[PDB]
Amino acid sequence: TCPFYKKIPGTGFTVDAFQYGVVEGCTAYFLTHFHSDHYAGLSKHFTFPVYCSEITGNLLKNKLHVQEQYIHPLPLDTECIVNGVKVVLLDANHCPGAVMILFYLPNGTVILHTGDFRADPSMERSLLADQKVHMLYLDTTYCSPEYTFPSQQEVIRFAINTAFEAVTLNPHALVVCGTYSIGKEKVFLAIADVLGSKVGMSQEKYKTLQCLNIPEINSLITTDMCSSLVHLLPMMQINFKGLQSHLKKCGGKYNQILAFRPTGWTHSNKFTRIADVIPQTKGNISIYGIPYSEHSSYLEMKRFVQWLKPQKIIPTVNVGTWKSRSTMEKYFREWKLEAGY
Ligand code: NI
């Protein structure tokens, strides 16, 4: 049974609610982005209307084989009427094709569902500026002050300089980047660009990247592993055993691996600056964990909410424990009292 926080009151609408069978009274199923916890339950046998971005719609069609007649892509930043309700999709600054949804209820209530997002000051000048929001369904993944991480720009800077130094020292070194879903493509694309290489990867991963409307992509990626000095692998294979094995595969073309694991937050963030980060090393293999987040830091989340001034907040993440729920409600009250709404 569908939880309350995936339902939009006063509508026939649900959000990211595909694993509950037929939801009673739902006339349209919205999908914020193509990550598995959110699409869980969709397949080629789905027969209700799905509303999403163009990119999410490319992945539904090609990866999950949802039939075209049930895919309803919408442009961003555009007022659209769905089953007699005005909606807008806004960029979520999460993975490719990820959206926030603004719903304009017939009784005059306005609701924003953030899906998954990384709040940014640029959102203060979207169509959100133009009117008041009564309810906010919030991505609360990192809603605690211990969750600090650097900007995406500083993290990419650190990775580019690290890779460039290593491969300029040893032209026979290979760079490997782990992946398990879309998102974080900047990590591998930036490193390949500085090394003047294409990124090599499996056929299934190449297919996924081909759905993403990235400019000049045929120039950046390939399935020819042996022509490439940046390889993508599944995240699970980014360990000493997995990498030793992969090094064998290239047929003595390479004598050193430098590998990156983009994680979200890790408790090394409560001590270490990005400048200061060091790998784990075993012989000719080094592994860097780098804190590339596609979710709001605590500070970025607080800033967005105190700017938005919602009348009520409904968390969509960390909702399964009483201790979590109680922590989150405390911070919402602090923020409201400090800003005065
Ligand atoms: Ni996500």
Q: How far apart are CA 188 and CA 247, in angstroms?
A: 18
Which domains does the chain show, CATH number per domain? 1-147+296-341 (3.60.15.10), 148-295 (3.40.50.12650)
Spacing, Cα 142 to ligand 1 middle (Å): 13
Dihedral (CA of 218, 224, 225, 226) sign: negative
Which technique was used to obtain these atomic coordinates? X-ray
Six-digit token string for 168: 């300029």
First to last CA, the chain: 35
Q: How many beta carbons lie within 10 A of that of residue 327, not counting itself? A: 14
Q: How far apart are CA 324 and CA 317, in angstroms?
A: 9
At a CB cut-off of 8 Å and minimum separation 6, what does 51 contact? Answer: 28, 29, 30, 31, 72, 74, 82, 87
Is 206 within 8 Å of 221 (Cβ atoms)? yes
Spacing, Cα 98 to ligand 1 middle (Å): 8
Closest CA to 50 of 81, 18, 9, 93: 18
Resolution of this entry in Å? 1.8
Closest CA to 258 of 156, 145, 171: 171
Six-digit token string for 140: 């609360």
Six-digit token string for 219: 């120039």
Spacing, Cα 35 to ligand 1 middle (Å): 5
The DSSP secondary-structure symbol of 169 reads: H
Residue linked to tokens 């990867």:
201
Nearest 5 degrees, angle CA 134-CA 135-CA 136?
130
Q: How far apart are CA 192 and CA 254, in angstroms?
A: 16
Q: How many beta carbons lie within 10 A of that of residue 239, not counting itself? A: 17
> How do 199-200 and 221-222 pair as beta strands?
parallel
Is 90 within 8 Å of 82 (Cβ atoms)? no
At a CB cut-off of 8 Å and minimum separation 6, what does 87 contact? Answer: 51, 74, 79, 80, 81, 101, 102, 103, 104
User: What are the backbone dihedrals phi and psi of residue 54, each rounded to the nearest 5 degrees, phi first?
Assistant: -55, -45
Q: How far apart are CA 203 and CA 152, in angstroms?
A: 28
Is 98 within 8 Å of 212 (Cβ atoms)? no
Spacing, Cα 307 to ligand 1 middle (Å): 23
Q: How far apart are CA 136 and CA 310, in angstroms?
A: 6
Q: How far apart are CA 198 and CA 222, in angstroms?
A: 6
Indicate the residue type of 218: N
Spacing, Cα 256 to ligand 1 middle (Å): 33
**309 — alpha (psi -120 to 50), left (phi > 0) or beta?**
left
> For residue 174, what is the enclosing H or E element?
strand 173-179
Residue 163: C-alpha distances to residues 40, 175, 243, 282, 325 (Å): 36, 7, 17, 18, 41
